[PDB]
Structures are given as C-alpha cells and as structure tokens.
C-alpha cells in the first residue's frame, strides 16, 4: 500500500 498522504 501507500505510506504517506502524497502517495495516498
């Protein structure tokens, strides 16, 4: 998955 808001 993604681990930061930018990638999210």
């Amino acid at each position: 998955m993604d681990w930061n808001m930018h990638a999210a």
Partner: antibody
Amino acid sequence: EVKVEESGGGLVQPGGSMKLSCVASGFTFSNYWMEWVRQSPEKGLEWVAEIRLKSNNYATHYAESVKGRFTISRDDSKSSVYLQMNNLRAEDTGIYYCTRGGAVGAMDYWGQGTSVTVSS
Amino acid sequence: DVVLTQTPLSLPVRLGDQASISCRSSQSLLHSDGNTYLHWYLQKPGQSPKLLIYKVSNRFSGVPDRFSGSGSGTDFTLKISRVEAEDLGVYFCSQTTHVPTFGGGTKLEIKR
C-alpha cells in the same frame, strides 16, 4: 504556525499500561494523518503507529513490534491523537514523538516528544 | 523493513565550509507513482526535529537553498553549504515509500 505537543510520558513497570496524548494547533487537524514515532539509544528512530482520516474510517496501522499492544486513536474535535500502550516491555523504552503526516509525503511537523521508561 | 544507513556518524565542519551527509537504503525507494519518498531532518539538542528536504531534493518551508538534497538509486546525499553555528545538531534521513523507517543520524560538529 503549526504546533505539536505530547504528554503522558513517565515510568511504568513491565507489563503495565499508559496512554500518551498529543495536541496540535495551527492547522485543520482532521485533514491530516497523525503518527507516533519513538526514539531509543538502541534502535534509533522507529515508526510506531499511524491513524488516517475520517473518510478512511480512521484506518490505523502499527509497527509489527507493537501490534496488539498499542492502540492509536484521535479526536478531531479536540485536535488530539492518542497512543494507548498496554503490556509494555523494556524494549518500549524511548522518547515518543507525535508527528503530522504531511501533504508533501513526509511526517512534516513534530513535537518535542515525551519520555517513556519501562523498568522494574 | 527498509534499512537506511547514514554516514558519517560524526561530521566536523568549519564555519562557511560544506558538509555532506549520506544515506544508503537497502532497497529502491522509487514508488510506483514515480516519486521517491526520501526525506531529511535536523534535530537540535532538546528541540523537535524539523523537516528540511522532502522527496529527495525539495526544500521545506523556511529552508534556505544552502540545504540541498540529491539521489542516485539507493544512495542519497544531503549537502549543507556555508555552514553556520546554528546548523549544529543531528541530521537524519527517513523514507515513506515503504513502511516508514529512519537513518541512524549524523552529528554535525562545528570546527572552530
């Protein structure tokens, strides 16, 4: 002027519990993920737990090392994030930092930390 | 988990000179979306660590161009030009491409 301040640190016996609190200001709290990272002289900085947005049903994620023992929660109305620590172990000793998951893709604002010591 | 190895552990530097801190990851930090989430922070004694560079080379709020970040594969470098007294502290890298991890830090010492 983003501000982040943690509290609740202290000494706890192995197997005990304690809840850490963090209050932020200077931004719309509900629009950001919040994180807890801890620092120890033997593991350095280590990510502990993360809690996302309401639209994510407050999805949480934990480091394998604290799985099932720590619980992260937040109260947007009070711009606070919490870390309930149970079944504490000596390895949990360290300075606990509360951080904002930034829109830039990095934990962008940190508090000064609150110290936690698990000892007999 | 991704391991971030920083070097040197201690870095003595004269005022006005440049300091280079390295961070080497155990795996590529290139996210499928094309971004590389490698960041740099500075933690002064007793103070809250502060974000300096995000996504390899972007300067964060209030950070002067004296601070520059670069990367090549699994190697990343933080360069602090025209070092000044207030630059002392521990600089550390972190990545958020995979489960968040951090480098061990580099203590910048001012050589006077």
